[PDB]
Structure formats: structure tokens, C-alpha cells
């Protein structure tokens, strides 16, 4: 029984490791998207400021 538990634990550990690598990869992707959005938002603000200055 102990030996079986060990095999399952090893398999479980492998699955967990795969998920973690996958989780990290997903986070990297999500983080890139947030940065892109913030950058886009910043660009928009700059554009608005420029337009405002011209109008003034």
C-alpha cells in the first residue's frame, strides 16, 4: 500500500510540476497583456494632452 501511495504521489508531483510551469507561463502572458493595456492607456492620455495643447 505504501509503495502504491508513493507511485501515485510521484505521478501527482509530476502533474503539479507541469501545472506550475503552465501557471507561470500563463502569468507571463497575462502580465504582458496588462503592460500593453497600460502602455496603450498612457499613449491615449499623451494624445489627448497634445490635442488639448493645440486647441488651447
Short mmCIF file of N, CA and C in Angstrom, two decimals:
data_model
loop_
_atom_site.label_atom_id
_atom_site.label_comp_id
_atom_site.label_asym_id
_atom_site.label_seq_id
_atom_site.Cartn_x
_atom_site.Cartn_y
_atom_site.Cartn_z
N UNK A 1 0.83 -1.19 0.00
CA UNK A 1 0.00 0.00 0.00
C UNK A 1 0.87 1.25 0.00
N UNK A 2 1.93 1.22 0.81
CA UNK A 2 2.83 2.35 0.89
C UNK A 2 3.49 2.58 -0.45
N UNK A 3 3.90 1.51 -1.11
CA UNK A 3 4.55 1.62 -2.41
C UNK A 3 3.60 2.24 -3.42
N UNK A 4 2.34 1.81 -3.40
CA UNK A 4 1.36 2.36 -4.34
C UNK A 4 1.17 3.85 -4.09
N UNK A 5 1.11 4.21 -2.81
CA UNK A 5 0.90 5.58 -2.44
C UNK A 5 2.05 6.38 -3.00
N UNK A 6 3.25 5.81 -2.93
CA UNK A 6 4.41 6.50 -3.45
C UNK A 6 4.32 6.75 -4.95
N UNK A 7 3.88 5.75 -5.71
CA UNK A 7 3.79 5.92 -7.16
C UNK A 7 2.81 7.01 -7.52
N UNK A 8 1.67 7.01 -6.84
CA UNK A 8 0.63 8.00 -7.07
C UNK A 8 1.15 9.38 -6.71
N UNK A 9 1.88 9.46 -5.60
CA UNK A 9 2.44 10.72 -5.16
C UNK A 9 3.42 11.25 -6.19
N UNK A 10 4.24 10.36 -6.74
CA UNK A 10 5.21 10.77 -7.76
C UNK A 10 4.49 11.30 -8.99
N UNK A 11 3.43 10.59 -9.41
CA UNK A 11 2.65 11.00 -10.57
C UNK A 11 1.98 12.33 -10.29
N UNK A 12 1.46 12.47 -9.07
CA UNK A 12 0.81 13.69 -8.64
C UNK A 12 1.81 14.83 -8.66
N UNK A 13 3.03 14.56 -8.19
CA UNK A 13 4.07 15.58 -8.16
C UNK A 13 4.39 16.02 -9.58
N UNK A 14 4.47 15.07 -10.51
CA UNK A 14 4.77 15.42 -11.89
C UNK A 14 3.67 16.30 -12.46
N UNK A 15 2.42 15.95 -12.16
CA UNK A 15 1.29 16.72 -12.66
C UNK A 15 1.33 18.13 -12.10
N UNK A 16 1.65 18.24 -10.82
CA UNK A 16 1.72 19.53 -10.16
C UNK A 16 2.81 20.38 -10.80
N UNK A 17 3.95 19.76 -11.08
CA UNK A 17 5.05 20.48 -11.69
C UNK A 17 4.64 21.01 -13.05
N UNK A 18 3.95 20.17 -13.83
CA UNK A 18 3.52 20.61 -15.15
C UNK A 18 2.57 21.79 -15.03
N UNK A 19 1.64 21.70 -14.08
CA UNK A 19 0.67 22.76 -13.89
C UNK A 19 1.37 24.06 -13.51
N UNK A 20 2.35 23.96 -12.62
CA UNK A 20 3.07 25.13 -12.17
C UNK A 20 3.81 25.77 -13.32
N UNK A 21 4.46 24.97 -14.15
CA UNK A 21 5.18 25.56 -15.28
C UNK A 21 4.16 26.26 -16.16
N UNK A 22 3.03 25.60 -16.36
CA UNK A 22 1.95 26.14 -17.16
C UNK A 22 1.40 27.40 -16.51
N UNK A 23 1.26 27.38 -15.19
CA UNK A 23 0.73 28.53 -14.48
C UNK A 23 1.65 29.72 -14.65
N UNK A 24 2.95 29.47 -14.54
CA UNK A 24 3.93 30.53 -14.70
C UNK A 24 3.86 31.09 -16.11
N UNK A 25 3.73 30.21 -17.10
CA UNK A 25 3.66 30.65 -18.48
C UNK A 25 2.43 31.53 -18.68
N UNK A 26 1.30 31.12 -18.11
CA UNK A 26 0.07 31.88 -18.25
C UNK A 26 0.22 33.25 -17.63
N UNK A 27 0.86 33.30 -16.46
CA UNK A 27 1.05 34.57 -15.78
C UNK A 27 1.93 35.49 -16.62
N UNK A 28 2.95 34.94 -17.25
CA UNK A 28 3.81 35.78 -18.06
C UNK A 28 2.97 36.40 -19.17
N UNK A 29 2.11 35.60 -19.79
CA UNK A 29 1.26 36.10 -20.86
C UNK A 29 0.27 37.16 -20.36
N UNK A 30 -0.35 36.90 -19.22
CA UNK A 30 -1.32 37.84 -18.66
C UNK A 30 -0.65 39.15 -18.32
N UNK A 31 0.54 39.04 -17.73
CA UNK A 31 1.30 40.22 -17.35
C UNK A 31 1.67 41.02 -18.59
N UNK A 32 2.02 40.36 -19.68
CA UNK A 32 2.37 41.10 -20.88
C UNK A 32 1.17 41.93 -21.36
N UNK A 33 -0.01 41.32 -21.30
CA UNK A 33 -1.23 41.98 -21.73
C UNK A 33 -1.54 43.22 -20.91
N UNK A 34 -1.36 43.13 -19.60
CA UNK A 34 -1.63 44.26 -18.72
C UNK A 34 -0.70 45.42 -19.05
N UNK A 35 0.57 45.09 -19.30
CA UNK A 35 1.55 46.10 -19.65
C UNK A 35 1.16 46.77 -20.96
N UNK A 36 0.71 45.97 -21.92
CA UNK A 36 0.30 46.52 -23.20
C UNK A 36 -0.88 47.47 -23.01
N UNK A 37 -1.84 47.09 -22.17
CA UNK A 37 -3.00 47.93 -21.93
C UNK A 37 -2.58 49.25 -21.30
N UNK A 38 -1.74 49.16 -20.28
CA UNK A 38 -1.32 50.35 -19.56
C UNK A 38 -0.58 51.26 -20.52
N UNK A 39 0.25 50.67 -21.36
CA UNK A 39 1.00 51.45 -22.33
C UNK A 39 0.04 52.12 -23.29
N UNK A 40 -0.97 51.37 -23.73
CA UNK A 40 -1.96 51.92 -24.65
C UNK A 40 -2.70 53.07 -23.98
N UNK A 41 -3.04 52.89 -22.71
CA UNK A 41 -3.75 53.93 -21.96
C UNK A 41 -2.88 55.18 -21.85
N UNK A 42 -1.59 54.97 -21.59
CA UNK A 42 -0.65 56.07 -21.46
C UNK A 42 -0.54 56.81 -22.79
N UNK A 43 -0.51 56.06 -23.88
CA UNK A 43 -0.40 56.67 -25.20
C UNK A 43 -1.63 57.54 -25.46
N UNK A 44 -2.79 57.03 -25.08
CA UNK A 44 -4.04 57.76 -25.28
C UNK A 44 -4.03 59.07 -24.50
N UNK A 45 -3.55 59.02 -23.27
CA UNK A 45 -3.50 60.21 -22.43
C UNK A 45 -2.59 61.26 -23.06
N UNK A 46 -1.45 60.80 -23.57
CA UNK A 46 -0.50 61.70 -24.21
C UNK A 46 -1.13 62.35 -25.43
N UNK A 47 -1.86 61.55 -26.21
CA UNK A 47 -2.51 62.07 -27.40
C UNK A 47 -3.53 63.13 -27.01
N UNK A 48 -4.29 62.86 -25.96
CA UNK A 48 -5.29 63.81 -25.50
C UNK A 48 -4.63 65.11 -25.07
N UNK A 49 -3.52 65.00 -24.36
CA UNK A 49 -2.82 66.19 -23.90
C UNK A 49 -2.35 67.01 -25.08
N UNK A 50 -1.80 66.33 -26.09
CA UNK A 50 -1.32 67.04 -27.26
C UNK A 50 -2.46 67.75 -27.97
N UNK A 51 -3.59 67.07 -28.11
CA UNK A 51 -4.73 67.67 -28.77
C UNK A 51 -5.20 68.88 -27.98
N UNK A 52 -5.21 68.74 -26.66
CA UNK A 52 -5.65 69.82 -25.78
C UNK A 52 -4.75 71.04 -25.92
N UNK A 53 -3.44 70.80 -26.00
CA UNK A 53 -2.50 71.90 -26.13
C UNK A 53 -2.74 72.64 -27.43
N UNK A 54 -2.95 71.91 -28.51
CA UNK A 54 -3.16 72.54 -29.81
C UNK A 54 -4.41 73.40 -29.77
N UNK A 55 -5.46 72.87 -29.15
CA UNK A 55 -6.71 73.60 -29.05
C UNK A 55 -6.52 74.88 -28.25
N UNK A 56 -5.76 74.79 -27.16
CA UNK A 56 -5.52 75.95 -26.32
C UNK A 56 -4.78 77.03 -27.11
#
